[PDB]
Amino acid sequence: GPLGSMSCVHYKFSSKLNYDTVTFDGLHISLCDLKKQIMGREKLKAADCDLQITNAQTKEEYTDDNALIPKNSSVIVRRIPIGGVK
């Protein structure tokens, strides 16, 4: 991504063959914001699903919305159901 005041996370969706990129400010993005950006971006149903993110590099899963993903982390985005369909 643009080196400087941009912060870019390479996130590949499980539905995608490629990594996509959220450009955010700061250094890291809280999962709540990370998911909320992506859900609106890609058109996810947040009424049915939540967005489950796993790191592709460390393999760490981001379970809570407070979990933070830095631009130095390329993560995998998995769509999971909230609490209806299971």
Side-chain angles (χ1 to χ4, degrees):
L3 179 61
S5 306
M6 286 278 67
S7 300
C8 305
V9 164
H10 287 252
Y11 68 94
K12 115 170 185 64
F13 216 112
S14 46
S15 312
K16 299 187 183 197
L17 187 62
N18 59 339
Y19 291 73
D20 201 287
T21 31
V22 279
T23 45
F24 55 92
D25 58 284
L27 204 180
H28 38 228
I29 176 168
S30 305
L31 182 62
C32 193
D33 204 73
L34 179 288
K35 299 184 301 181
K36 273 55 168 178
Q37 292 188 31
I38 299 176
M39 297 185 174
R41 179 179 178 120
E42 300 299 288
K43 313 324 191 66
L44 279 63
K45 57 280 289 298
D48 179 89
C49 299
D50 189 15
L51 197 53
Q52 181 52 210
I53 314 298
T54 306
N55 199 277
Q57 311 176 152
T58 66
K59 304 303 298 296
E60 248 297 79
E61 288 183 278
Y62 303 92
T63 54
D64 195 275
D65 285 63
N66 93 96
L68 72 95
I69 302 77
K71 50 171 181 179
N72 300 90
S73 304
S74 305
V75 294
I76 310 298
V77 182
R78 186 204 316 162
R79 179 180 61 116
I80 63 87
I82 39 177
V85 295
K86 48 180 65 180

